[PDB]
Design a protein around this nucleic acid. Structure first.
Ligand SMILES: [Zn+2]
Length: 231
DNA sequence: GTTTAGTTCCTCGTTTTCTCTCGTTG
DNA sequence: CCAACGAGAGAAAACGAGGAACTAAA
C-alpha cells in the first residue's frame, strides 16, 4: 500500500528489513545497518557446518547441547539455515532478492548446499526418524503408482514370539482409503539384501540410509521384478 | 511350527498454522 | 510523535513413515 513504499526502499539500498534485537542473530545493528557479531557469527559458521554433517535440525540441537550452547527453538535454526541474509542478500517477501551492503557470514557455495539438504528432506517424509527404514522413500509400486512402506509385524503363536519385517505397497496399509492392487509384499530382509548387492556393483546405519538416497532416485517393484532407477 | 496379513491405538522429527511484537519509513 | 505493514519468533496443530501388541489364517 503506502507503507510498502518504505520497505522496497531499503531493499534497493541493500539494507535489511529486520533490525529488531533478537531477530538479527549473528549481526549487530548500528544506525539500522548490520555489522558482524564475532560471538554469534562463530556459532552460525558452526551451525551451518554441523547441519551439513547431521543433515537434521534435531541432531544438530543434540550435538550443540554437547558443546555448551543453549538450544534454541526448532524453527529458530531452520530460519537461520535458510535465510540468505547470511550469504549477503536482502529480500522483500522472500522473492525479490538483491545483494546487501552488509558483510556475509556463510559462503554462497555452502548456503545452497544446505538448501539442497532441506530440499532432499522435504521429498522424504520421516527420513530423520529413529524408525526410518533403510529404503524409507525409495520404493514405488509399479502396478499402483504409490510408494511402498516399511512394516514390522511381530506375533505370538503358541507361546513362542516371532518377529518379521516387510515392505508393502501403501494400499495394503491404509485399508480405509485405498484398495489393494495385488502387488507383492516383499520380505524386508530379502529385498534390502537384493538392493545391497546391486548397489555394490555401481558404514553405520544412517550412513547407509543417506548414502542410498544420493545414488538412487526410486526403486520400482512389479511383482517379482526389482528395477533400480539410478540417479 | 513358521509366516503373512488385519486391525487399534501410539511415536515424534518435521511441517504448517496463526497470533504477538518490533521498528523503519511514510 | 505516530500508524502500518513485512518479518522473525514460537506454541500449537497437523503430517506421515513407522511402531507395539494382539488376532487369525496361510
Ligand atoms: Zn500399489
Amino acid at each position: 500500500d503506502r507503507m510498502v513504499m518504505g520497505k522496497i526502499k531499503r531493499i534497493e539500498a541493500g539494507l535489511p528489513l529486520t533490525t529488531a534485537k533478537g531477530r538479527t542473530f549473528g549481526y549487530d545493528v548500528i544506525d539500522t545497518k548490520l555489522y558482524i557479531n564475532e560471538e554469534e557469527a562463530k556459532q552460525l559458521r558452526l551451525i551451518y557446518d554441523i547441519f551439513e554433517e547431521e543433515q537434521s535440525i534435531t541432531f544438530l540441537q543434540k550435538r550443540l547441547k554437547k558443546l555448551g550452547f543453549k538450544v534454541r527453538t526448532y524453527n529458530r535454526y531452520n530460519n537461520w539455515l535458510t535465510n540468505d541474509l547470511y550469504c549477503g542478500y536482502v529480500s522483500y517477501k522472500d522473492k525479490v532478492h538483491v545483494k546487501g551492503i552488509h558483510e556475509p557470514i556463510i559462503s554462497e557455495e555452502q548456503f545452497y548446499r544446505v538448501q539442497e539438504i532441506f530440499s532432499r528432506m522435504g521429498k522424504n517424509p520421516n527420513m530423520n526418524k529413529e524408525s526410518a527404514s533403510l529404503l524409507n522413500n525409495l520404493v514405488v509400486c509399479s502396478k499402483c503408482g504409490l510408494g511402498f512402506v516399511h512394516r514390522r509385524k511381530d506375533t505370538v503363536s503358541r507361546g513362542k514370539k516371532y518377529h518379521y519385517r516387510y515392505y508393502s505397497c501403501k494400499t495394503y496399509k491404509h485399508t480405509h482409503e485405498l484398495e489393494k492392487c495385488g502387488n507383492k509384499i516383499w520380505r524386508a530382509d530379502k529385498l534390502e539384501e537384493l538392493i545391497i548387492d546391486r548397489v555394490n556393483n555401481y558404514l553405520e546405519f544412517r550412513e547407509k540410509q543417506l548414502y542410498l538416497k544420493s545414488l538412487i532416485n526410486k526403486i520400482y517393484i512389479d511383482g517379482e521384478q526389482v528395477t533400480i532407477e539410478w540417479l
